[PDB]
Amino acid sequence: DIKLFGKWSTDDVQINDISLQDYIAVKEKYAKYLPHSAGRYAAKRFRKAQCPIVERLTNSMMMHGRNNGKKLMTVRIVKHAFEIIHLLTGENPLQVLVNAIINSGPREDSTRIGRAGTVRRQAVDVSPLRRVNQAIWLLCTGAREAAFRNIKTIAECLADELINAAKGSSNSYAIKKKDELERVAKSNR
Amino acid sequence: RVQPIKLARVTKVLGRTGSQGQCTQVRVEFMDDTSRSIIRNVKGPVREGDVLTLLESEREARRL
Amino acid sequence: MGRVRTKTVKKAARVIIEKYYTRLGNDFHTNKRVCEEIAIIPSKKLRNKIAGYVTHLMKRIQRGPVRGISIKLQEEERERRDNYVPEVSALDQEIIEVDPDTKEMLKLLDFGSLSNLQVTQPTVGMNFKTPRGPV
Amino acid sequence: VRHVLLRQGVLGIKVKIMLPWDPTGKIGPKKPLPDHVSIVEPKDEILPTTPISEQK
RNA sequence: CCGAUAACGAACGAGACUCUGGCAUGCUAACUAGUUACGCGACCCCCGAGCGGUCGGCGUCCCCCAACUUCUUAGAGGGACAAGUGGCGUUCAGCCACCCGAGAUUGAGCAAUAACAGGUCUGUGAUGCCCUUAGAUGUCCGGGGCUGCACGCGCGCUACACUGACUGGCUCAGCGUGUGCCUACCCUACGCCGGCAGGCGCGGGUAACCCGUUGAACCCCAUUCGUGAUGGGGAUCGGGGAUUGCAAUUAUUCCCCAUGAACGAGGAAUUCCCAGUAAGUGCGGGUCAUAAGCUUGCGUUGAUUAAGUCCCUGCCCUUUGUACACACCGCC
Ligand SMILES: [Mg+2]
């Protein structure tokens, strides 16, 4: 009924694991016509959980100095990327994004201060909110270094980054970084 | 041979640790055996009632 | 956080409560409407802060005797103190359980052989004192 | 703030006077201090007797 | 702050306070602010609408020849108090969550005792003392210098590009300034010429009356480019044209055509920052005969992360040790 960007109904999108279903916000209560709403989502802690993840991706995709207010450009980038992934795969772009987020969130990490063995002294599992944040950050970063110095534009780079991450193919920078973090944490157990 | 990943829900949040506050230590209750509950340190923002994956079951329990 | 009231508001609240307990109530807006005439407040923010603390203290007063003085509370306390002597004294027992040592003391005092004394059986064992140290 | 040209140099004088509060205002400020709170004294108004009706 | 209590009663600082921002279809008020309505028009549909649509076109404080204050302005007031609910708490002081609300922590200003051999005698007709005072260290005039370059460092601006550059079109601000005692130097509409920088006439404004509805930039929508030191970058440098001034050389600044250098995201290190914030982006003021890569403000777009800790760097309170007291940059 809401049809983000005029299509791609949100009701058929399914979150495959209960770990992040309280933090992914594609459901009908958070279904928005357009990923642009100055909703004051950073005013209080945990308020970004009820912010739609399309808005989260739009907010994260505008980085590296040149791009800090160009949210309209980021929205058009997201729209073109969703068009591209719909053509390339045939399924819901929001479903592709949700699968990419779930497969990109690193399940555990390592952090400490002192005489670290390999990277950090202890291996630490992460929270679902940190999972979503890190996944979105990794996807946008992978798209950015994919699109920096080649003719392939940022729309296609984001699109195929999400496509590769949604399945899991080691061709996406997000899950390459995720696997590196998994190895580091497993060694630092 | 490796232990499968298993889910567990945060019941009570013990408090920050790691000496920089970078980790919060919580008490977490397993899905399969609700009577089973351990203490785990997790990084990132955590509020009680949310569920999270355990790649390995028992790592470290230490009251603050 | 950072909502702790200060001496100015607390002292003003206590003074006006002990001066105008009858007129004040538990409604914040009525209590902030009485302050403009029962007191001279240089600031509106100060006035309504004082009124809020007055409401809090009066809720505490109606639930119990806060240290703020109150005429009804004091007259109730005075009634409960300088009255309620029982119709029978607490010191006119028909019999008094009395120790043989005390009976000997009364005999030496010449108040021995009183009909209201019943001599108790002396205890045996001498097991007073707490065990010394821990354990 | 004033300067005194003494033989040894310059001597600085700073005088601060806290003016008293007065409603008249010709010796000090009319407005009271912001944190000063003054309360009027209530009357007796006991009324301990039987109800009456006074015709007037 | 509640409380304990050989203390009692006070005083400063904090807070309170002032300015600012957010709400008031509640009050007052508006031809130097408007809105609505009406009436003249102008244009489209006129198949047929017709109380159809647009007008920053013209009028209704021209004085009888409409009202009203939402929008703008600025005054008086209100409004928010941890007040209401739940929980925690000695059920005190308070803390957390939620409802209703514009708002449940808007930012500043002021800011104690004591001190530093901290900075200024180049702000002063503030000033002690010393120096000089007619071949002047006074003062004025001319020229030069303060810019000078094998080099090192700090604050910044521009970039390394396609989340882009170029070309065109469309569409949006808010602070705030504007003709001068001496003192000459204002902000500029419109018309004409020039390709541009500019020039020439005609006005307006000592200002909610004019610039000005401040048609700003980024952004948006289309075009070309195509992963190359390229249409990225615009340093260096040549020739020419204007402006200010008494004077432009060691180029004041501006304009046009040429050259297109390093630079392909930056070692060890290191700064700033929690919400309309960072950052991108332009516009005012100060300086100004000429002028901003500076600074002080303003708006526009607008986030990632965090609601924690004492790990580093520090600060506050208590206990403790001291051979320190110029106080650990000590002492020895
Ligand atoms: Mg070019």
From Swiss-Prot, chain A:
Protein family per UniProt: Belongs to the universal ribosomal protein uS7 family.
Keyword Nucleus attached: yes
Q: What is its main location?
A: cytoplasm
Subunit structure as annotated in this protein's UniProt entry:
Component of the small ribosomal subunit. Part of the small subunit (SSU) processome, composed of more than 70 proteins and the RNA chaperone small nucleolar RNA (snoRNA) U3.
A single GO molecular function, which one? Answer: mRNA binding
Crosslink Glycyl lysine isopeptide (Lys-Gly) (interchain with G-Cter in SUMO2): position given as: K32
Show the GO cellular component annotation of the record.
cytoplasm; cytosol; cytosolic ribosome; cytosolic small ribosomal subunit; extracellular exosome; focal adhesion; membrane; nucleolus
Keywords from the named record: Acetylation, Cytoplasm, Isopeptide bond, Nucleus, Phosphoprotein, Ribonucleoprotein, Ribosomal protein, Ubl conjugation
Which portions of this protein are annotated as coiled-coil regions?
none
Record's InterPro entries?
Ribosomal_uS7, Ribosomal_uS7_CS, Ribosomal_uS7_dom, Ribosomal_uS7_dom_sf, Ribosomal_uS7_euk/arc
Q: Where located?
A: Cytoplasm; Nucleus, Nucleolus
Organism lineage reads as:
Eukaryota, Metazoa, Chordata, Craniata, Vertebrata
Sites of Phosphoserine modification: S127
A Gene Ontology BP annotation from the UniProt entry: translational initiation
Record PTM N6-acetyllysine, positions in chain:
K32
One short Pfam family name for this protein?
A: Ribosomal_S7
Entry superkingdom: Eukaryota
* UniProt name for this protein: Small ribosomal subunit protein uS7
Answer whether the UniProt record assigns the keyword Repeat to this protein.
no
Q: Which NCBIfam families match?
A: PRK04027.1, uS7_euk_arch
Q: List the disulfide bonds.
A: none
From Swiss-Prot, chain B:
Instruction: Report the subcellular localization.
Output: Cytoplasm, Cytosol; Cytoplasm; Rough endoplasmic reticulum; Nucleus, Nucleolus
Q: What is this protein called?
A: Small ribosomal subunit protein eS28
Report which gene this protein is encoded by: RPS28
Q: Which InterPro entries match?
A: NA-bd_OB-fold, Ribosomal_eS28, Ribosomal_eS28_CS
Residues found modified as Phosphoserine: S37
| GO CC annotations, alphabetized | cytoplasm; cytoplasmic side of rough endoplasmic reticulum membrane; cytosol; cytosolic small ribosomal subunit; extracellular exosome; nucleolus; nucleoplasm; ribosome
Q: What is its main location?
A: cytoplasm
| HAMAP family the record matches | Ribosomal_eS28 (MF_00292)
Q: Supply the source organism for this entry.
A: Homo sapiens
Q: Which residues cross the membrane?
A: none
Q: How does it assemble?
A: Component of the 40S small ribosomal subunit. Part of the small subunit (SSU) processome, composed of more than 70 proteins and the RNA chaperone small nucleolar RNA (snoRNA) U3.
PROSITE patterns xrefs: RIBOSOMAL_S28E
Record disease entry = Diamond-Blackfan anemia 15, with mandibulofacial dysostosis: A form of Diamond-Blackfan anemia, a congenital non-regenerative hypoplastic anemia that usually presents early in infancy. Diamond-Blackfan anemia is characterized by a moderate to severe macrocytic anemia, erythroblastopenia, and an increased risk of malignancy. 30 to 40% of Diamond-Blackfan anemia patients present with short stature and congenital anomalies, the most frequent being craniofacial (Pierre-Robin syndrome and cleft palate), thumb and urogenital anomalies.
Q: Keywords assigned by UniProt?
A: Acetylation, Cytoplasm, Diamond-Blackfan anemia, Endoplasmic reticulum, Nucleus, Phosphoprotein, Ribonucleoprotein, Ribosomal protein
Swiss-Prot record, chain C:
Q: Which gene encodes it?
A: RPS17
Family to which the UniProt record says this protein belongs: Belongs to the eukaryotic ribosomal protein eS17 family.
Q: Which InterPro entries match?
A: Ribosomal_eS17 (IPR001210), Ribosomal_eS17_CS (IPR018273), Ribosomal_eS17_sf (IPR036401)
Source organism per UniProt: Homo sapiens
One GO biological process term:
translation
Main localization is cytoplasm
> What is the protein's given name?
Small ribosomal subunit protein eS17
Q: Which residues carry this modification: Phosphoserine?
A: S113
As annotated, the Glycyl lysine isopeptide (Lys-Gly) (interchain with G-Cter in SUMO2) covalent link is placed at K103
Summarize the disease involvement recorded for this protein.
Diamond-Blackfan anemia 4: A form of Diamond-Blackfan anemia, a congenital non-regenerative hypoplastic anemia that usually presents early in infancy. Diamond-Blackfan anemia is characterized by a moderate to severe macrocytic anemia, erythroblastopenia, and an increased risk of developing leukemia. 30 to 40% of Diamond-Blackfan anemia patients present with short stature and congenital anomalies, the most frequent being craniofacial (Pierre-Robin syndrome and cleft palate), thumb and urogenital anomalies.
- Phosphothreonine modified-residue sites: T130
Q: Which GO terms describe its molecular function?
A: RNA binding; structural constituent of ribosome
Annotated NCBIfam families: PRK01151.1
Share the record's PTM remark. Answer: Ubiquitinated at Lys-103 by RNF14 and RNF25 in response to ribosome collisions (ribosome stalling).
Among PANTHER family, the record links this protein to: 40S RIBOSOMAL PROTEIN S17
Curated annotation (Swiss-Prot), chain D:
Q: Cross-link of type Glycyl lysine isopeptide (Lys-Gly) (interchain with G-Cter in SUMO2): positions?
A: K43
UniProt modified residues of type Phosphothreonine? T49, T50
Its subcellular locations are: Cytoplasm; Nucleus; Nucleus, Nucleolus; Mitochondrion inner membrane
Q: Disulfide pairs?
A: none
Q: What top-level branch of life does the organism fall under?
A: Eukaryota
> Position(s) of the covalent cross-link Glycyl lysine isopeptide (Lys-Gly) (interchain with G-Cter in ubiquitin)?
K31, K43
- Phosphoserine modification, residue list: S38, S53
Query: According to its UniProt record, how is this protein modified after translation?
Result: Methylation by PRMT1 is required for import into the nucleolus and for ribosome assembly. Sumoylation by SUMO1 enhances protein stability through increased resistance to proteolysis.
Known partners and oligomeric status: Component of the 40S small ribosomal subunit. Identified in a IGF2BP1-dependent mRNP granule complex containing untranslated mRNAs. Interacts with HNRPD. Interacts with PRMT1; the interaction methylates RPS3. Interacts with SUMO1; the interaction sumoylates RPS3. Interacts with UBC9. Interacts with CDK1; the interaction phosphorylates RPS3. Interacts with PRKCD; the interaction phosphorylates RPS3. Interacts with PKB/AKT; the interaction phosphorylates RPS3.
Membership in a protein family:
Belongs to the universal ribosomal protein uS3 family.
What is the protein's given name?
A: Small ribosomal subunit protein uS3
Species of origin reads: Homo sapiens (Human)
User: What lineage, starting at the top, does this entry show?
Assistant: Eukaryota, Metazoa, Chordata, Craniata, Vertebrata
Task: Supply the gene name.
Answer: RPS3
- Residue span relative to the full protein: 172 to 227 of 243
